[PDB]
Amino acid sequence: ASTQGISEDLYNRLVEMATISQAAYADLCNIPSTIIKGEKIYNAQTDINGWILRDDTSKEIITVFRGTGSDTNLQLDTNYTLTPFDTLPQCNDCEVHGGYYIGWISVQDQVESLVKQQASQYPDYALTVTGHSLGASMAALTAAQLSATYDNVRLYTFGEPRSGNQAFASYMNDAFQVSSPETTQYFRVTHSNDGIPNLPPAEQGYAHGGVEYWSVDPYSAQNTFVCTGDEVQCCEAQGGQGVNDAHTTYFGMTSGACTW
Numbered sequence: 639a640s641t642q643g644i645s646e647d648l649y650n651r652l653v654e655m656a657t658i659s660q661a662a663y664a665d666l667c668n669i670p671s672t673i674i675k676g677e678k679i680y681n682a683q684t685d686i687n688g689w690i691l692r693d694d695t696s697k698e699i700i701t702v703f704r705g706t707g708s709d710t711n712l713q714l715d716t717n718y719t720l721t722p723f724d725t726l727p728q729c730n731d732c733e734v735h736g737g738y739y740i741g742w743i744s745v746q747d748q749v750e751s752l753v754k755q756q757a758s759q760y761p762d763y764a765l766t767v768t769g770h771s772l773g774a775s776m777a778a779l780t781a782a783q784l785s786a787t788y789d790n791v792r793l794y795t796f797g798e799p800r801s802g803n804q805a806f807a808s809y810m811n812d813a814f815q816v817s818s819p820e821t822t823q824y825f826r827v828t829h830s831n832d833g834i835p836n837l838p839p840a841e842q843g844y845a846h847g848g849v850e851y852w853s854v855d856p857y858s859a860q861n862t863f864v865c866t867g868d869e870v871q872c873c874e875a876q877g878g879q880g881v882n883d884a885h886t887t888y889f890g891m892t893s894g895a896c897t898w
Contacts, residue, residue, distance in 0.1 A: 639865075639866050639867060640852075640863050640864065640865045640866070640871060640872065641863065641864050642860070642861075642862075642863050642864075643859060643860045643861075643862065643863075643864075644851065644859050644862045644864060645859065646859045648825075648859070649858070649859035649862060650859075651794070651825075652794065652825060652827055652851060652853075652862070652889070653889045654670075655766070655768045655794040655796070655825075655827075656770070656794075656796050656827065656888045656889045656891060657669065657889075657891060657898055658673070658691070658700065658702050658768060659702060659705075659768050659769050659770040659773060659774075659794075659796050659888075660770060660796075660888065660891045660892065660893050660894065660895070660898075661894075661896070661898075662687070662688065662689070662702050662703065662704040662705075662769065662770070662773060663704055663705065663707055663770075663893045663894030664894040664895075664896050666689060666691075666702075667894075667896040668896050668898055670693075672693060672694070672695050673691050673692070673693050673700070674691060674692045674693070674694070675689060675691055676689060676690040676691055676692060676752065676756070677689070677690055677748075677752055679701075679703070679745050679748055679749060679752070680745070680748075681744035681745050681748075683744060684710065684711075684714060684740060684741050684744040684745070685707070685708045685710040685711050686703065686704075686711075686741045686744055686745045686776065687703070687704040687707065688701065688702055688703040688704060688745070688749075688769070688773070688776070689701075689702055690749075690752045690753065690756060692756065692760070692763070696764075697760075697762060697763045697764065698763050698764040698765070698766045698792075699753065699756045699757060699760060699763050699764070699765055699766065700766045700767075700768065701749065701752075701753065701765070701766070701767045701768070701777070701780060702767075702768050702769055702773070702777075703768075703769035703772070703773035703774075703776035703777055703780070704769070704772075704773050705769060705770045705771030705772040705773040705774070705797075705893065706771055706772045707894075711772055713737065714737035714738060714740060714741050714772060715737055715771075715772050715799075716737065717735070717736045717737030717740070718735065718736065718737070718837075718838040718842060718844075719736035719737075720733040720734070720735070720736065720802070720803060720842075720843055720844075721733055721734055721735075721736040721739045723739070723779075723782070723802065723806060725742070725743065725746060725783060726782060726783050726786060728786060729782065729805070729806065729809045730805065731803075731805040732782075732802060732803065732805045732806040732809055733802055733803045733805065733806060733843075734779060734801060734802035734803075734806055735775055735799060735800070735801055735802060735838065735844075737772075738772065738775040738776060738778075738779055738799075738801060739779065741772070741775075741776055741779075742776060742779040742780065742783075745776075746783070749780055750783070753765065753784060753788075757788060763790075764790050764791075764792050765784055765788050765790055765791045765792065766791075766792040766793075766794065767780050767781040767784065767791065767792070767793050767794075768793070768794045768795070768796075769795060769796070770795075770796040770797055770888065770893060771796075771797050771798075771799075771834060771885065771893075772799075774795035774796055774797060774798035774799070774801075775795075775798060775799050775801045777793060777794075777795055777798075778793065778795060778798060778801040778802075778810070778847075779801065781793040781810070781814075781824070782806070782809065782810055782813070785810075785813040785814070786813075791813075791814075791823065792823045792824075793810075793814060793823065793824045793825065793848070794825045794827065795824075795825070795826050795827060795848070796827045796828075796829075796888045797827075797828065797829065797832050797834045797835065797885050797888065798826055798827075798828075798834070798835060798846070798848075799834055799835065799837055799838065800835070800836075800837065800838050800839075800840065800844035800845060800846050801844075801846075801847075802844065802845070803843050803844060803845060804843075804845040806845075806847070807845040807846060807847035808847070809847075810824060810847040810848065811824075811847045811848070814847075814848065816847060816848055816849055819849045819864050819866065822848070822849040824847065824848035824849065825848065825849065825851055826846060826847070826848030826849060826850045826851065827850075827851045827853065827888065828850055828851070828852050828853065828872065828873030828874075829852075829853045829857075829873070829884045829885070829887070829888050830853065830854055830855055830873070830876065830878075830884040831873070831876035831877065831878035831882065831884050832873055832876075832878050832882065832884040832885045833878035833879045833880040833881065833882050833884075833885060834878075834880070834881065834885050835873045835874055835878075836873075836874055836878060837880070845868070846874075849864060849865070849866055850864075850865040850866070850872050850873065851863070851864060851865075852864075852865050852872035852873050853888065853889065857889050857890060
């Protein structure tokens with residue numbers, strides 16, 4: 639099913655998380671001054687880049703991952719080999735995108751240690767995870783892992799690939815209350831004919847989870863659709879091919895542009 643239009647409050651949240659996601663490509667340029675920038679998440683071998691942040695005014699600890707900013711990252715993006723999600727073996731039969739798994743493994747210890755410290759200090763804060771493109775799948779794997787330990791994890795993704803198999807998607811749907819848009823804590827944001835949410839193809843054993851929030855132009859709260867279920871519709875019906883203009887530009891913000 640689908641409905642057109644979301645609340646301004648929700649819309650504004652999506653835009654804020656999209657801003658941080660798109661700023662992650664340029665050392666978090668021009669993000670709100672009320673966000674406290676914490677430690678840089680980094681592995682040289684995978685070139686995974688991200689940060690832990692805190693917003694005391696919204697009572698959230700935010701983990702953001704940069705999408706592809708190097709050929710090293712592109713190697714990760716284009717490895718579609720399904721891999722058992724062995725860092726979270728309670729996810730029975732869960733398999734994930736092989737490239738993003740290699741990414742995740744490279745930064746897991748650092749992410750978990752930073753979140754543990756911050757979450758213990760701010761136990762009432764939401765644990766929000768976000769990213770664009772490769773950063774969106776990194777966010778998904780991270781949120782999955784965090785959700786087994788913490789009850790207040792929230793996930794906002796932009797131009798997210800299919801991050802794993804149906805087992806993985808179903809695990810995330812359960813963990814993030816996806817059965818209703820009224821309860822969901824997983825906001826899978828897509829834009830117009832973005833090609834990336836069609837990859838890897840479902841026929842290779844891949845599936846999306848989350849509630850899809852489909853931004854159609856001209857972007858606005860009124861022009862964002864809420865798409866539920868597993869039928870082909872919204873971004874996945876538009877026939878977008880790979881990296882296209884719709885992929886790079888969410889709520890008018892192009893990856894690394896810094897013109898917000």
